[model samples]
Target: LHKEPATLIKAIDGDTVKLMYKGQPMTFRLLLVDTPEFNEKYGPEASAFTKKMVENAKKIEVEFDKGQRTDKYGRGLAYEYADGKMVNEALVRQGLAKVAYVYKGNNTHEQLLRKAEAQAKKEKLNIWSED
Candidate 1:
């Protein structure tokens, strides 16, 4: 699954994080979703939600899809897991983020994420609250 254990150094925002992987601290941009910026609409809620999930987890790990490991900013690109649940999909289901930045081939979690997003939209959760 190309998964590896990591320690959460910080939750930078809903979709970005700093982690200690293999004893080296690195920033990561979570794949397959985009949350609002820290000062933008719904941003605070998203950030707080991500922080709570990652900080309180009994375990944290990251899984990479079949694409570039790092993005333009040199941040690692991966899906974060809190305990055993994928944080990317969790945020989508909770309407804290929207599926985005999808490339041609790196879609390991796309199906599950889209399903979660559909559920969120149907329930009009957070980001999906607008009519």
Candidate 2:
């Protein structure tokens, strides 16, 4: 797959960003990760964390997936690579988000994300912590 180079135009929330793609601006939501709402508990923290990552990323890359290009909100559903790190996996590792969608019956990355979530839960990291 040809990974497209992307730049963070804006971070809408923890799970979403308005990114520049193919010289055009569009909504890009992190695939398989569900971050909390802004008004909800721990939501702000997640949003801030995501924003920091996006802002400080040396380079950003977008990996397209199978079918359903744009979500209902018209946001592009793709995995984000921030300077070689998988943003989606990073979010899960920090316990800032939860794995929600499984495309293609458990792809390798999704499986790894699931494992990361499990470890995060066990460690009570970030969102998994008792408030």
Q: lDDT for each of the candidates?
A: 0.90, 0.83
lDDT (tens digit, per residue) of candidate 1 on 1-131: 57799998878998899999889899999888989998999999999989999999989999989877887777988989999888999999999999986864678888899999999999999999994
Candidate RMSDs in Å, in order, are 1.1, 2.0
What residue runs in model 1 are displaced by over 4 Å at the alpha carbon?
Answer: none
- Residue 95 of model 1 has an lDDT of 92
TM-score of each: 0.95, 0.90
Q: How accurate is candidate 1 locally (lDDT)?
A: 0.90
lDDT of 2 by residue, 1-131 (tens): 44789888888888888899989899997878888988887789888988888899989998877656676777788888888888889889989899986754324467878988998899999888984
User: What's model 2's TM-score?
Assistant: 0.90
Question: What TM value does model 1 have?
Answer: 0.95
Candidate 2: regions farther than 4 A off? 103-108
